[PDB]
Write a structure and sequence with these properties.
Order of helices and strands of chain B: EEEEHHEHE
Shape of chain B: globular
Helix content of chain A: under 10%
Distance between the termini of chain B: 9 Å
Strand order of the largest sheet of chain B: 2-3-4
Number of strands of chain B: 6
Strand content of chain A: 35-45%
InterPro entries (chain B): PQQD, PqqD_sf
Oligomer: heterodimer
Order of helices and strands of chain A: EE
Bound molecules: zinc ion
Number of helices of chain A: 0
Keywords (chain B): Metal-binding, Zinc
Radius of gyration of chain B: 12 Å
Largest interface: A-B, 16 and 26 residues
Shape of chain A: elongated
Radius of gyration of chain A: 14 Å
Structural class of chain B: alpha+beta
Protein name (chain B): Coenzyme PQQ synthesis D
Number of domains of chain B: 1
Number of strands of chain A: 2
Number of helices of chain B: 3
Helix content of chain B: 40-55%
Strand content of chain B: 25-35%
Structural class of chain A: mainly beta
GO molecular function (chain B): metal ion binding
């Protein structure tokens, strides 16, 4: 079993293509 | 209601974390820890109930917290077109 932390979506922005 | 990861999303796992690339919006994202675990379960086609149960089994956390946090996380994924079929 692991310690819990609230899930978060990190946005980095535009990818390099 | 039935849901799934967008067919436009590429997932790149890097120990602990996942980088997500949306091929049509051209945006990239990062997940870690519980977010990454939830993503992995979504990749397997696990339903919200199953995801709640998995997080409750794997983490020192109460079910109400998991439910509240999962709803917001899934909504965030849906808002960025990373997850399809989401409903409250
Ligand atoms: Zn994966
Ligand atoms: Zn259950
Ligand atoms: Zn959508």
């Amino acid at each position: 079993m692991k310690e819990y932390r609230s899930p978060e979506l990190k946005e980095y922005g535009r990818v390099e293509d | 209601n039935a849901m799934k990861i967008s067919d436009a999303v590429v997932s790149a796992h890097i120990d602990d974390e996942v980088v997500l690339l949306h091929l049509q919006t051209g945006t990239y994202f990062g997940l870690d820890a519980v977010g990454s675990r939830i993503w992995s379960l979504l990749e397997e086609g696990k339903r919200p109930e199953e995801i709640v149960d998995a997080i409750c089994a794997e983490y020192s956390v109460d079910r109400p917290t998991v439910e509240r946090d999962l709803r917001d996380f899934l909504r965030a994924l849906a808002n960025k077109e990373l997850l399809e079929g989401y409903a409250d």
